[PDB]
Design a protein around this ligand. Structure first.
Ligand SMILES: O=Cc1ccc(-c2cn([C@@H]3O[C@H](COP(=O)(O)OP(=O)(O)O)[C@@H](O)[C@H]3O)c(=O)[nH]c2=O)s1
Ligand SMILES: O=Cc1ccc(-c2cn([C@@H]3O[C@H](COP(=O)(O)OP(=O)(O)O)[C@@H](O)[C@H]3O)c(=O)[nH]c2=O)s1
Ligand SMILES: CCCCCCCCO[C@@H]1O[C@H](CO)[C@H](O)[C@H](O)[C@H]1O[C@@H]1O[C@@H](C)[C@@H](O)[C@@H](O)[C@@H]1O
Ligand SMILES: CCCCCCCCO[C@@H]1O[C@H](CO)[C@H](O)[C@H](O)[C@H]1O[C@@H]1O[C@@H](C)[C@@H](O)[C@@H](O)[C@@H]1O
Ligand SMILES: [Mn+2]
Ligand SMILES: [Mn+2]
Lengths: 283, 290
């Protein structure tokens, strides 16, 4: 796309703003931290493409209680100025709160089965997103962002995250060496990653990409989980373990910093985080 | 694409290698410097896609003299391990020197007209690349890389540069403020950029991208030059001025550091350059008077 004239501060080749963190992966994907992007430029780029972003969130059984704060804060902070389609997957369509939406934003309630086992609720998100990629998303949105519901937006989360495939650094482990990552370590599981492999430990609560890439990721993870199930094994961190195996072998084209997936009660507000954008609500 | 198990040092989130330079633009395009990339990973990614790279170079009039060292050093340093097509445009096909190529690398020579004015030889590269894309001469590769011929490969230039659209930081201006950039400053020119705009000054001697993006860029720059011609205007730095206007409005998805476009005889070898990959060769004797 062709941008109009814009007035903004010139980038300085010899004076980077972030010197305290890694801002690009070894496969040349940016790692998104505050200070690395000019949102005015990116906003104009994505508006000129008429971008629609889908946001998927599961609110099943007791978790429907989190929806009100999740959606109201999403209206203040998520992709503001862009076309947004919320996909709320729930077993209680009647319990979805009436949240007032900004212009250009819409919400669809998708009714789904609640699995008894909390691990199955978390893990079967992969199957449901994969199925809906086909049923709906492919014809409705350009990008999908797939997140946990037990969360609130506190600061900007915008088109800087958009790319064919992204994962997010887990807030617990961004400073950890690969040997300490809680990857699945049993070779009997499809999620197995040995101790001398791994780039990052990605959080299962925030990933996304193009519809095509997300369809592929979620289908792959679901299949891997089904194979494990038939072999009587379940990965240590469920869907997140499979997400990690997938992103090790299919490198993300952007990686989000833990600004995008945080828990302030458990981890505070470290100096390397200039903004806390999307944060846990006590569960 | 799905990679196999690989063993390499873990990237450290709290410990960047390059702290002395900007390694990502404000629109989140990487700026490619030594230390930012693991070429083992990138080679695997690109080979899994069976990537073919086309390298276009113009050697018109006395510039055929540059071909021998250009092609020999490309054999040593450019995209080694990947399929490469050299597309050499010349007015003297019989003057293209014999150069032995590695497996999977192919030379195609095409005869083209020699414009009288050197400015025109340089500028008309955009029209020629655009036309030969459209005619399916240049379109059957995955990426096109478009360079000057008066150059030598000195170190690795590989798939770390590939992306839908890339420009390269010109060696004379990487540390300069935007008001110092030698953009076309006449409002009457299509290449006009005023003093309060501009991200970088990109060099006309090294740009590229996917076939689709290179087709679009070269067609756009050619049409802009034709509009200027009809208005009786020739931009200050010719095709480079239009390239700069194009990349200001269509941001590149990677930007190459000056490691990739240098002149050591003129500028030395400053500390910020850990490698010099593609460098100018003296060209005073190859000049022709308009
Ligand atoms: O009592 C234990 C539970 C663990 C997960 C449960 C669950 C999760 N979910 C969805 O799965 C996501 C992941 O579960 P979680 O937030 O509890 O997991 P983590 O924050 O540890 O990753 C939630 O954000 C919801 O979107 C539900 O909708 N209903 C639920 O009952 S219930
Ligand atoms: O006598 C003055 C000349 C200036 C350019 C000339 C020219 C350039 N070219 C091509 O245009 C490119 C740009 O010209 P250049 O390398 O001389 O200019 P710079 O952009 O490095 O200043 C060259 O690398 C060649 O590919 C030719 O093939 N033949 C030429 O006679 S001749
Ligand atoms: C060396 C650091 C040692 C300390 C690490 C502290 C955070 C641990 O985090 C858990 O990590 C697990 C994987 O190993 C799962 O991702 C789990 O869902 C996550 O807890 C979730 O995310 C957390 C951030 C909290 O919000 C917790 O309530 C959630 O259940
Ligand atoms: C004193 C600080 C500003 C000047 C700093 C030193 C380089 C100047 O560079 C010229 O810059 C022009 C645009 O302003 C054109 O790109 C020209 O082609 C280029 O010269 C080309 O590239 C050069 C590097 C040399 O190889 C020269 O011989 C070439 O003709
Ligand atoms: Mn959660
Ligand atoms: Mn040159």
């Amino acid at each position: 796309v062709s941008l109009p004239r814009m007035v903004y501060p010139q980038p300085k080749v010899l004076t980077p703003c972030r010197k305290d963190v890694l801002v690009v992966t070894p496969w040349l994907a940016p790692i998104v931290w505050e200070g690395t992007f000019n949102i005015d430029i990116l906003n104009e780029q994505f508006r000129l493409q008429n971008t629609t972003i889908g946001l998927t969130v599961f609110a099943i059984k007791k978790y429907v209680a989190f929806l009100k704060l999740f959606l109201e804060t999403a209206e203040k902070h998520f992709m503001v100025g862009h076309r947004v389609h919320y996909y709320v997957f729930t077993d209680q369509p009647a319990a979805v709160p009436r949240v007032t939406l900004g212009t250009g934003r819409q919400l669809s309630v998708l009714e789904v089965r609640a699995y008894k086992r909390w691990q199955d609720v978390s893990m079967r998100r992969m199957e449901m997103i994969s199925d809906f990629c086909e049923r709906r998303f492919l014809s409705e949105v350009d990008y999908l962002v797939c997140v946990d519901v037990d969360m609130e937006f506190r600061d900007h989360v915008g088109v800087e995250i958009l790319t064919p495939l992204f994962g997010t650094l887990h807030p617990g482990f961004y400073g950890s060496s690969r040997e300490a990552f809680t990857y699945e370590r049993r070779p009997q599981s499809q999620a197995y990653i040995p101790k001398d492999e791994g780039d990052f430990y990605y959080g299962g609560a925030f990933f996304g990409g193009s519809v095509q890439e997300v369809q592929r990721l979620t289908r792959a993870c679901h299949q891997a989980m089904m194979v494990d199930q038939a072999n009587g094994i379940e990965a240590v961190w469920h869907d997140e373990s499979h997400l990690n195996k997938y992103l090790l072998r299919h490198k993300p084209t952007k990686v989000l910093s833990p600004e995008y997936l945080w828990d302030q009660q458990l981890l505070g507000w470290p100096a390397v985080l200039r903004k806390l954008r999307f944060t846990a609500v006590p569960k």
